[PDB]
Design a protein around this motif. Structure first.
Motif, PDB file in Angstrom:
ATOM      1  N   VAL A   1      55.019 -13.430   5.112  1.00  0.00           N
ATOM      2  CA  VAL A   1      54.454 -14.289   4.079  1.00  0.00           C
ATOM      3  C   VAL A   1      53.370 -15.162   4.698  1.00  0.00           C
ATOM      4  O   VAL A   1      53.403 -15.470   5.896  1.00  0.00           O
ATOM      5  CB  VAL A   1      55.567 -15.107   3.400  1.00  0.00           C
ATOM      6  N   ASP A   2      52.371 -15.524   3.894  1.00  0.00           N
ATOM      7  CA  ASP A   2      51.233 -16.255   4.439  1.00  0.00           C
ATOM      8  C   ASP A   2      51.422 -17.759   4.314  1.00  0.00           C
ATOM      9  O   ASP A   2      51.309 -18.488   5.306  1.00  0.00           O
ATOM     10  CB  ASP A   2      49.946 -15.812   3.749  1.00  0.00           C
ATOM     11  N   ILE A   3      51.697 -18.247   3.106  1.00  0.00           N
ATOM     12  CA  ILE A   3      51.843 -19.674   2.855  1.00  0.00           C
ATOM     13  C   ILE A   3      53.202 -19.906   2.206  1.00  0.00           C
ATOM     14  O   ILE A   3      53.657 -19.113   1.378  1.00  0.00           O
ATOM     15  CB  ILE A   3      50.704 -20.224   1.962  1.00  0.00           C
TER      16      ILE A   3
ATOM     17  N   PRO B   1      58.659 -15.275  16.592  1.00  0.00           N
ATOM     18  CA  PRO B   1      57.362 -14.577  16.650  1.00  0.00           C
ATOM     19  C   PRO B   1      56.262 -15.279  15.875  1.00  0.00           C
ATOM     20  O   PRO B   1      55.088 -15.190  16.252  1.00  0.00           O
ATOM     21  CB  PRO B   1      57.683 -13.195  16.064  1.00  0.00           C
ATOM     22  N   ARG B   2      56.609 -15.973  14.797  1.00  0.00           N
ATOM     23  CA  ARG B   2      55.651 -16.713  13.989  1.00  0.00           C
ATOM     24  C   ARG B   2      56.053 -18.178  13.959  1.00  0.00           C
ATOM     25  O   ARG B   2      57.224 -18.500  13.731  1.00  0.00           O
ATOM     26  CB  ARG B   2      55.578 -16.153  12.567  1.00  0.00           C
ATOM     27  N   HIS B   3      55.087 -19.059  14.187  1.00  0.00           N
ATOM     28  CA  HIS B   3      55.313 -20.494  14.155  1.00  0.00           C
ATOM     29  C   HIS B   3      54.696 -21.086  12.897  1.00  0.00           C
ATOM     30  O   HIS B   3      53.820 -20.485  12.272  1.00  0.00           O
ATOM     31  CB  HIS B   3      54.720 -21.179  15.390  1.00  0.00           C
TER      32      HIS B   3
ATOM     33  N   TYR C   1      40.412 -16.310   6.025  1.00  0.00           N
ATOM     34  CA  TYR C   1      40.990 -17.223   7.005  1.00  0.00           C
ATOM     35  C   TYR C   1      42.513 -17.216   6.936  1.00  0.00           C
ATOM     36  O   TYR C   1      43.189 -17.288   7.969  1.00  0.00           O
ATOM     37  CB  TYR C   1      40.432 -18.630   6.785  1.00  0.00           C
ATOM     38  N   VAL C   2      43.069 -17.147   5.725  1.00  0.00           N
ATOM     39  CA  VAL C   2      44.518 -17.069   5.562  1.00  0.00           C
ATOM     40  C   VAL C   2      45.043 -15.744   6.102  1.00  0.00           C
ATOM     41  O   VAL C   2      46.092 -15.692   6.756  1.00  0.00           O
ATOM     42  CB  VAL C   2      44.896 -17.283   4.084  1.00  0.00           C
ATOM     43  N   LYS C   3      44.309 -14.655   5.851  1.00  0.00           N
ATOM     44  CA  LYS C   3      44.706 -13.345   6.358  1.00  0.00           C
ATOM     45  C   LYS C   3      44.667 -13.298   7.880  1.00  0.00           C
ATOM     46  O   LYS C   3      45.533 -12.684   8.512  1.00  0.00           O
ATOM     47  CB  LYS C   3      43.804 -12.261   5.772  1.00  0.00           C
ATOM     48  N   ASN C   4      43.670 -13.941   8.489  1.00  0.00           N
ATOM     49  CA  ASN C   4      43.543 -13.905   9.940  1.00  0.00           C
ATOM     50  C   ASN C   4      44.454 -14.899  10.645  1.00  0.00           C
ATOM     51  O   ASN C   4      44.555 -14.851  11.874  1.00  0.00           O
ATOM     52  CB  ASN C   4      42.093 -14.159  10.343  1.00  0.00           C
ATOM     53  N   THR C   5      45.113 -15.790   9.912  1.00  0.00           N
ATOM     54  CA  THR C   5      46.033 -16.747  10.516  1.00  0.00           C
ATOM     55  C   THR C   5      47.360 -16.049  10.780  1.00  0.00           C
ATOM     56  O   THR C   5      48.050 -15.640   9.840  1.00  0.00           O
ATOM     57  CB  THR C   5      46.218 -17.960   9.609  1.00  0.00           C
ATOM     58  N   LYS C   6      47.711 -15.899  12.058  1.00  0.00           N
ATOM     59  CA  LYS C   6      48.983 -15.274  12.410  1.00  0.00           C
ATOM     60  C   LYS C   6      50.154 -16.180  12.062  1.00  0.00           C
ATOM     61  O   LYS C   6      51.228 -15.702  11.682  1.00  0.00           O
ATOM     62  CB  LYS C   6      49.003 -14.926  13.896  1.00  0.00           C
ATOM     63  N   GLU C   7      49.967 -17.489  12.195  1.00  0.00           N
ATOM     64  CA  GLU C   7      51.009 -18.447  11.873  1.00  0.00           C
ATOM     65  C   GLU C   7      51.211 -18.533  10.364  1.00  0.00           C
ATOM     66  O   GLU C   7      50.344 -18.150   9.576  1.00  0.00           O
ATOM     67  CB  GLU C   7      50.644 -19.819  12.434  1.00  0.00           C
ATOM     68  N   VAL C   8      52.378 -19.032   9.961  1.00  0.00           N
ATOM     69  CA  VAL C   8      52.631 -19.241   8.542  1.00  0.00           C
ATOM     70  C   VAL C   8      52.070 -20.594   8.126  1.00  0.00           C
ATOM     71  O   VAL C   8      52.347 -21.626   8.752  1.00  0.00           O
ATOM     72  CB  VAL C   8      54.130 -19.102   8.228  1.00  0.00           C
TER      73      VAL C   8
HETATM   74 MG   LIG Z   1      48.564 -15.078   7.590  1.00  0.00          MG
END
Ligand SMILES: [Mg+2]
Ligand SMILES: [Mn+2]
Length: 541
Positions: free
Chosen positions: A293-295, A323-325, A59-66
């Protein structure tokens, strides 16, 4: 219960609160309760409870947002309020955090200094705080800061003790274990990572960032060192790779380079934790966000900045049209921050003072806790007017020891060495010449004996023989030489010392902190559960 309550109230009213100036109780307004626009979303906690930790990773990998981790309950008040934030102020807003901010990846509420400080000063059980917060926040993952070899304590512990602490903490509601080592040594973290995996929770293998990867003058911690460490941590089976920037040393260009280079290296999600001490935390998180970065670790705005984390609202508005929110409800976050400001007004005796961004942390690399502790130590011994020279000596001692990673407790070693060198008027040549007659501080001796583990590249050989004269030096894990602990014997002895049968959490708390837990039990028998009091009444009576 009532008699204990008026006993504590009279004691605080007459003799004042220990460690703070005696001051009449100011009248405070009720803290503002947030007006939240609630949305029902499936959090990471629901994914962990239903499908497991690997599904959380997916789920973290598939989340485009940070994603954001709120460090308000641990690190924001550890940095700014001397870890003195009480459970009453947390539980006033825990439900509002759980419902108004379901997009949070996790909430850091345990570990670090909280476990010792709650028992020692707040006279409340950290296990009780964990239970109350877990009941109030069923849909928020609970992050804890875990030292791989010593859990929350500082003594040397066997592996079964650490495994039992992990099992009990996972049972009581810890979901993410951020496992780090003070010297970034893999054997100290391997067993803790494996135990967290066996308990079904999320294991965060952590790399402590020190130095500058973009500075060629310091090639000991270059990008290859971090890439190899990330590969080794990926080999351990940890779910998420974490990057701890304890002093705010990571520059935004270095942040982008490091996060990108770790991104082609390992396939784990990357969790970045930094402090805003230099004032560059927001741009560091932004540069990490462009790198993917993810988190990232953020705090509420009224408890952010300075030695604390970058603000969650400001990092939302920094990435609003990029590009990332950021994945947060910023209106609910501001509504919660109103409460956090109102209850931060309670902790005036523990405020550090007027705070400005300080880029001198790029020079001495002291974490904020080590900074405050060394300032207080220099004030106590009559060298508080020489703190700039103390910081210079801290940097020189860090270089003399071989450029070690400075976090608790390894930063305390460098601070004790710097204070001892300033006290006795010693230079590097003076230690290398007259160190045989010198009696070094016990933390430095314990570090050079190998009690903290093995640093990167080993010790300087001459300085080691100078500092430890005849004491034995170990080259492996100190937990292998730890004295054996039997939980039945400890449980029986604790049942003798306190007047009831202890739980598993109480036995594990007695093992980590023997004298502190007994003092807490004595204060509980004398004054009762003072955690139920409001903070102005708790401090001023
Ligand atoms: Mg991510
Ligand atoms: Mn921190």
């Amino acid at each position: 219960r009532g008699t204990k309550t008026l006993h504590y109230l009279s004691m605080i009213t007459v003799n004042g609160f220990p460690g703070i100036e005696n001051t009449e109780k100011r009248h405070f307004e009720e803290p503002r309760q947030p007006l939240l626009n609630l949305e029902k979303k499936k959090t990471a906690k629901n994914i962990l409870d239903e499908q497991g930790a690997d599904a959380v990773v997916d789920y973290v990998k598939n989340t485009k947002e940070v994603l954001l981790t709120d460090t308000t309950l641990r690190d924001a008040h550890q940095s700014l309020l001397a870890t003195r934030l009480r459970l009453q102020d947390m539980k006033g807003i825990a439900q509002a955090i759980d419902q108004g901010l379901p997009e949070l990846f996790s909430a850091e509420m345990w570990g670090g200094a909280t476990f010792d400080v709650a028992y020692r000063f707040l006279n409340e059980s950290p296990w009780y705080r964990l239970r109350k917060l877990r009941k109030l926040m069923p849909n928020t993952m609970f992050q804890m800061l875990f030292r791989g070899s010593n859990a929350v304590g500082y003594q040397n512990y066997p592996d079964n003790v650490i495994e039992e602490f992990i099992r009990v903490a996972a049972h009581e509601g810890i979901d993410v274990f951020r496992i780090f080592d003070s010297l970034n040594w893999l054997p100290q973290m391997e067993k803790s990572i494996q135990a967290v995996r066996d308990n079904g929770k999320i294991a965060e293998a952590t790399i402590c960032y020190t130095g500058d990867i973009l500075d060629p003058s310091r090639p000991k911690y270059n990008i290859q060192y971090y890439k190899d460490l990330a590969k080794e941590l990926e080999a351990t089976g940890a779910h998420i790779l974490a990057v701890k920037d304890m002093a705010g040393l990571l520059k935004p260009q270095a942040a982008y380079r490091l996060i990108s280079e770790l991104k082609d290296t390992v396939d784990l999600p990357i969790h970045l934790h930094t402090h805003d001490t230099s004032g560059n935390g927001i741009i560091t998180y932004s540069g990490a966000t462009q790198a993917g970065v993810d988190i990232i670790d953020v705090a509420t705005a009224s408890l952010a900045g300075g030695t604390s984390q970058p603000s969650m609202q400001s990092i939302y508005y920094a990435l609003e049209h990029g590009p990332r929110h950021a994945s947060i409800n910023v209106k609910n976050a501001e509504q919660i921050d109103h409460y956090w400001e109102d209850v931060r007004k309670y902790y005036a005796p523990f405020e550090a003072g007027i705070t400005s961004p300080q880029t001198e942390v790029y020079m001495h690399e002291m974490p904020g806790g080590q900074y405050t502790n060394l300032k207080s130590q220099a004030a106590a011994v009559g060298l508080g007017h020489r703190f700039d020279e103390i910081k210079q000596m801290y940097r020189k001692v860090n270089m003399m020891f071989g450029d070690i990673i400075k976090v608790t407790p390894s930063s305390k070693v460098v601070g004790d060495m710097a204070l001892f060198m300033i006290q006795n008027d010693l230079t590097e040549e003076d230690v290398y010449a007259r160190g045989n007659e010198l009696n070094f501080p016990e933390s430095v001796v314990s570090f050079f004996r190998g009690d903290l583990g093995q640093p990167v590249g080993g010790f300087p050989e001459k300085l080691q023989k100078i500092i430890v004269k005849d004491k034995a030096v170990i080259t492996d894990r100190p937990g292998l030489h730890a004295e054996k602990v039997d939980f039945e014997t400890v449980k029986a002895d604790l049942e003798q010392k306190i007047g009831y049968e202890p739980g598993d959490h109480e036995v594990i708390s007695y093992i980590m902190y023997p004298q502190v837990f007994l003092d807490y039990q004595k204060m509980q028998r004398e004054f009762g559960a003072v955690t139920l009091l409001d903070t102005p009444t708790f401090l001023h009576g």
